[PDB]
Amino acid sequence: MDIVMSQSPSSLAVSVGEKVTMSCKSSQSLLYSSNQKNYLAWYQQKPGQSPKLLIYWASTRESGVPDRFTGSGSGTDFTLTISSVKAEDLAVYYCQQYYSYPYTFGGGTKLEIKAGSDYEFLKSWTVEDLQKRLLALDPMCEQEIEEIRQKYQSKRQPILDAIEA
Amino acid sequence: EVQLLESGGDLVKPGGSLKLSCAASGFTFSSYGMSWVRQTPDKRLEWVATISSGGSYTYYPDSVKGRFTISRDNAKNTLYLQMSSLKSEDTAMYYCARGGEGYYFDYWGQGTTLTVSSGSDYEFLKSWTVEDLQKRLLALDPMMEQEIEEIRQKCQSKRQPILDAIEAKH
Ligand SMILES: [Cl-]
Ligand code: NA
């Protein structure tokens, strides 16, 4: 069999500062006994942005990744923990094995902020966290606009082909 | 620094073909296995192809094997993906990535989008005058503009409380 990566939960609505635990199960051990390495990575992807490598060898942080992220586990059971979630951690987290072809990804765990009735809670954020959150909306919104352009490109093309003929 | 920049995405009919390119800079491209990874509209990530550093060996999943071809030019620092017999299910964002061949994907490009059209037959449009066809086009423009404007307005509704909170703290 191909190796199947299964993640849970599929989505989680969180409050800032909450501890978050994300799980990923592989159908086959990813541990090579001879070097005691697990061939398992975690990626972070925000909406409208490219995936970013976060953790690899199951527990090693990529450069710049803060220490509130911890990867753990071995063999078939892996975990990504955020000890205290920040707004800039609101993203989709994908696990991936690079143990054997075909390389396979889990379905992702989506972290999103809980909806409130008003925005007074934003006063408790730092200016830096507010600015990061604001600017995270820019690629998200642009990717939705581009999807619309692509939809109408597809709608226009049969008419353009008829005109050209 | 390291940069990967894809190009070539386009709208294609089912059964058609398309070739993507990825320009690599800021590292010794010929030393590294390279890959393509796609993201479907449901946001699932799927590995599509890996090529060895020297170009001699390629690897594919069964979903694209025999239809896709990954290739490289180590002197010109370019990665390619030729896609043939395209299917509706190939519609996705295609990312160039450094890695594969026993390693994680440590650098990812910005992505380029392939859209495979529906494959529906619009032969009846040939019976239309060019004037009637152009009017049908002009009617799509305000519809696209309205959907874009709706996204922009929804975006602003998210930005305004943050913008207000930032200014309230100065
Ligand atoms: Cl919150
Ligand atoms: Na001000």
Residue numbers in the entry:
A (entry chain L): 0 to 164
B (entry chain H): 1 to 170
Q: What do the study's own words say?
A:
Stable binding poses obtained by the simulation were further tested by site-directed mutagenesis and in vitro binding analyses. These studies mapped the epitope for 5G7 to a portion of C-terminal α6 helix of A3Bctd, with Arg374 playing an essential role.
To facilitate structural studies of the 5G7 scFv, we adapted the recently developed “Fv-clasp” strategy, in which the light and heavy chain Fv domains are held together by an antiparallel coiled coil helices (“SARAH” domain for Sav/Rassf/Hpo) with an additional disulfide bond for further stabilization of the heterodimer. The best crystal diffracted to 1.67 Å resolution and the structure was refined to the free R-factor of 23.4%. In the crystals, the antigen-binding cleft between the light and heavy chains of 5G7-clasp is occupied by the SARAH domain “clasp” helices, allowing for the formation of an array of 5G7-clasp molecules stacked in a head-to-tail fashion to form the crystal lattice. There are two 5G7-clasp molecules in the asymmetric unit of the crystal with essentially identical conformations, with a main chain root mean square deviation of 0.4 Å. The protein–protein interface involves many polar contacts and notably a larger number of tyrosine residues from the antibody, primarily forming hydrogen bonds or other polar interactions, but also making some hydrophobic contacts. However, a pair of stacked tyrosine residues from this loop (bolded above; Tyr100 and Tyr102) flanking Pro101 in the cis peptide bond conformation interact with CDR3 of the heavy chain that features a unique Gly-rich sequence (GGEGYY), which appears to help shape the latter for target binding.
